C-alpha cells in the first residue's frame, strides 16, 4: 500500500536506462578534438551530466513546478550536491555490488581501479559513502523511500530569502508525513524504519560538504576542466 | 548564478 | 527572461 502522494513523485522518476545511453553518448560524442584528460577529469564530466539531469528533474517534478525562477534556484542551490550524492548512493543500493562501483553510464567498476590512484581527502570521501550506503542495504531501502528523501532534501527548511516558504514547507511536512505512513503500513514489524531514513539526511547532508570541499581543493589544484558546471556551482 | 537560472528558464 | 541563452551569455562570467 503506497501512499497517495508517493506514487505521484514515483511518477517524476526520469528514465534510468535512458539517461545512462544519453550520459555515455555525451562522453564519448565530446571526446573528439585532442590528438588528453584524465580519469579524474572524465569523472568530473560525467558528474556535471549528471547534474544537467538532476536539474531537469528538479523543474518539470510535481511541485518544484510551481515555484517562481528564484526560488527554485536557491533550493536547488542548496542541495545541489546532496541530491546528486543520493543520486550517486541510491545507485549503489539498486545496482552496487561488492568491491565495485556502479557508475551513472551505466558500467560496474572495481573499487581497486578507484582505490589503486586515490589520495587522503578522496579517501576519507568514499569510505563515509560506503558506510551509508551500506547502512541503507541493510535498513532494505527501496525507491519509494528514495524519491521521499529526495524531496525531503529539496524542498529544504533551511533555506533562506525563500518567497512562497509556505509551500516548501507543505510539500516537507506532506512528504514527512507521507513516508510516516508509508513505512508503518509496509513495515509493521520494523517501527524504527522510519527514523533510520530521516537520520540518514544529516549524513547525506555531510559527506556533501566534504565532496564540495574536496572538489574545490581538486580545481584550485588545476585538476578540474575548464568551467563545467559544478565548478560554476561552487562558485557561489 | 546564470548557468543554474539558463538551465531552468532553457527550452 | 529575455530568451535563457541571451541573458545567460550577457551574465555569465567569462
Ligand atoms: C564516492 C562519493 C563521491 C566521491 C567524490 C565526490 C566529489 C567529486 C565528484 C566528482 C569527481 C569524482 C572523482 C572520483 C575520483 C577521480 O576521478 O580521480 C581520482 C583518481 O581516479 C580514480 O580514483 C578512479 C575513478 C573514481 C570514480 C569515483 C566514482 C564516484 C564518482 C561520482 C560520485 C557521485 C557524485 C558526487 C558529487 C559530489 C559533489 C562533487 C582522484 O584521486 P585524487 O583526487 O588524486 O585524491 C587526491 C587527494 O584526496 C588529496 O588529498
Redesign the pocket.
Known sequence: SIPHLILELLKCEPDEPQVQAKIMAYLQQEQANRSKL???????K??DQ?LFSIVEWARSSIFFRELKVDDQMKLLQNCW?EL??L??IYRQVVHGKEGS?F??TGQQ?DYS???????????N??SH?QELVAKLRSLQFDQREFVCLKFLVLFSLDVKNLENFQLVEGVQEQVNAALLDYTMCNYPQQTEKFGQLLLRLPEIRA??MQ??E??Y??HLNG?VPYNNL?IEMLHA | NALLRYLLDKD
Do not use: P, R
Not at chain 1, 584524465?38 to 568530473?44: A, D, E, H, P, Y
Not at chain 1, 581501479?113 to 578522496?122: F, N, V, Y
Open positions: 584524465s580519469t579524474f577529469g572524465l569523472m568530473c560525467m558528474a549528471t550536491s546528486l550524492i543520486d550517486h562501483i557508475l551513472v567498476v581501479i578507484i582505490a589503486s590512484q586515490a589520495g587522503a581527502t578522496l579517501n570521501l568514499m559513502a559527506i556533501s565532496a564540495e574536496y572538489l581543493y581538486k585538476d559544478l
